Amino acid sequence: NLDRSNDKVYENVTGLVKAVIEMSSKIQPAPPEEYVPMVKEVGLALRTLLATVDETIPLLPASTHREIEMAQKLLNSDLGELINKMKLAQQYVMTSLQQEYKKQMLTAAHALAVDAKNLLDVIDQARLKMLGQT
């Protein structure tokens, strides 16, 4: 379908999704000096992503703005929620609970990726609309 040669949204969503994947694969074996940076790395990707979307919004039809902004709302929400779990898992380092809190991080990050993927979907539908798809 759509040409992604210079689709910034699509790159930024890819790179945020890769970031979640990276963190996930790495998380279990990993102490806080390793797993905090990777969450930073997600957040940074996220912001790069929302900034791009802010620039794109005004190019896309009026009728789709609400829905997007909400998808953006959500992503922040998710990130927040991932940090919470991140902090919990740090409180309980080298204790019985370490691992079961890393589980709830993984759940949170998988949410983030899913929702970023959904954001991308919205954008596309917007472009397609604006590009005059049938």
Partner: peptide, 11 residues
């Protein structure tokens, strides 16, 4: 889990 996002990763 892993396998789920890894597909949507490259569509």
């Amino acid at each position: 889990r892993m396998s789920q996002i890894k597909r949507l990763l490259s569509e």
